[PDB]
Amino acid sequence: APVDPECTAKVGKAHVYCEGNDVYDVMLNQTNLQFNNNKYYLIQLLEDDAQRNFSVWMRWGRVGKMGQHSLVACSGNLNKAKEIFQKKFLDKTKNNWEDREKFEKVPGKYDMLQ
DNA sequence: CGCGTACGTGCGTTTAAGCGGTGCTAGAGCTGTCTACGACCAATTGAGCGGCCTCGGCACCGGGATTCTCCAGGGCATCATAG
Predict the structure, then answer these.
(1) Which positions on chain B have an atom < 7 Å from some protein CB?
(2) Can you give the residue range of the structural domain that contains A22?
(3) Closest nucleotide to A67's CA, by C1' atom?
């Protein structure tokens, strides 16, 4: 579960935040040959060293290609960052982040990399 | 083969052409003279002609540059699809 080197705007200067089970770094994949879907989605929380100053990285596209990405900055509070992260994970998977352990692949939603 | 417009057809309106006359006069046409211009003619001579050279512009030949034609693609943007 390494920080993406492809995030040039953020590589080098920060360390991804995790907590045991709850790892706020993850890559999800969805393949579906019926509809020719083959897409991935990485999410990464990064902390500043000086202050409690966090950033949420999202990156998604067809497998292999960087496609598109978004940076939502959360210098305000890390809890906001958890909100964005967990809410988006639910939106995208229909699984809660606290209950991420018992993942059940519903059709047309992301699964993660074991 | 399709499409669109402009000319033919037909019909009604206007106006000067045609017609017929009258009248006027410019100039066409005729006639008579006479002169100057061209025919004519003979002699003269030089301008022009045939002949004869002759040199430089042109024909030819070759060779290379440029242009014209031509085709193959360098490369690169439209489009479908992703996420």
Answers:
(1) 81-83
(2) 1-114
(3) B83
